[PDB]
Design an enzyme around this catalytic site. Structure first.
Site, PDB file in Angstrom:
ATOM      1  N   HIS A   3       0.832  -1.236   0.000  1.00  0.00           N
ATOM      2  CA  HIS A   3       0.000   0.000   0.000  1.00  0.00           C
ATOM      3  C   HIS A   3       0.862   1.280   0.000  1.00  0.00           C
ATOM      4  O   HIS A   3       0.266   2.377  -0.167  1.00  0.00           O
ATOM      5  CB  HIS A   3      -1.017  -0.008   1.124  1.00  0.00           C
ATOM      6  CG  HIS A   3      -0.474   0.134   2.504  1.00  0.00           C
ATOM      7  ND1 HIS A   3      -0.453  -0.935   3.385  1.00  0.00           N
ATOM      8  CD2 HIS A   3      -0.062   1.222   3.204  1.00  0.00           C
ATOM      9  CE1 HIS A   3       0.033  -0.522   4.550  1.00  0.00           C
ATOM     10  NE2 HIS A   3       0.290   0.796   4.456  1.00  0.00           N
ATOM     11  N   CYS A  29       3.332   1.783   9.814  1.00  0.00           N
ATOM     12  CA  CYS A  29       3.419   0.827   8.678  1.00  0.00           C
ATOM     13  C   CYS A  29       4.860   0.753   8.186  1.00  0.00           C
ATOM     14  O   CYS A  29       5.561   1.793   8.062  1.00  0.00           O
ATOM     15  CB  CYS A  29       2.409   1.096   7.569  1.00  0.00           C
ATOM     16  SG  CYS A  29       0.732   0.703   8.152  1.00  0.00           S
TER      17      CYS A  29
END
Length: 182
Positions: A41, A148
């Protein structure tokens, strides 16, 4: 503070860079030579910033299992003038559960951050942001935006990279030795 944090710090100090894409700043784990990993992502393109230096991407591959299910790991080869310490001997060979893991993050927003997340479950299937995803590890810590790409370690093993959470649990994509055979 203890031997888990010692191993995590050793990985962060030599095998991480700050990666910037159009989708944000990410902790990025360097594995060997000029090869690193980042969550898929992050949407890596032809150019990426590495510690605020414009860097050409020589190759990027969004990994999927042999059921053609998302794994949420992208392997990136960087046009960088320096190699990473080879840490492939710290990667697990098989899917597993773990005790006493640390999640480590290094960005502009979260410098030198280390979180003892405790027990890690082989969760398997997760609907991650609407995308069916396999080989997910789960830990019961309220992880947030900014983490992340964070590295999940135990003493002597680099087991995953943080890819999401639901406010109460955090989720990491497994790293396996077989991803980085050359």
């Amino acid at each position: 503070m203890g031997p888990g944090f010692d191993f995590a710090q050793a990985i962060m100090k030599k095998n991480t860079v700050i990666a910037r894409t159009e989708k944000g700043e990410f902790t990025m784990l360097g594995v060997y030579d000029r090869v690193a990993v980042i969550p898929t992502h992050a949407s890596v393109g032809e150019i990426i910033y590495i510690n605020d230096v414009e860097t050409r991407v020589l190759d990027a591959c969004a990994l999927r299992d042999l059921t053609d299910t998302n794994l949420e790991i992208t392997i990136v080869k960087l046009d960088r003038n320096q190699k990473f310490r080879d840490i492939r001997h710290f990667l697990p060979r098989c899917e597993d559960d773990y005790n006493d893991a640390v999640l480590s993050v290094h960005t502009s927003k979260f410098p030198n951050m280390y979180i003892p997340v405790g027990q890690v479950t082989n969760y398997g299937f997760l609907n991650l942001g609407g995308t069916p995803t396999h080989r997910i590890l789960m830990y019961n810590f309220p992880t947030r935006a900014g983490q992340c790409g964070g590295v999940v370690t135990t003493t002597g093993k680099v087991i995953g990279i943080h890819v999401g959470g639901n406010g109460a649990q955090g989720f990491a994509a497994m790293l396996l030795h077989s991803y980085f055979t050359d």
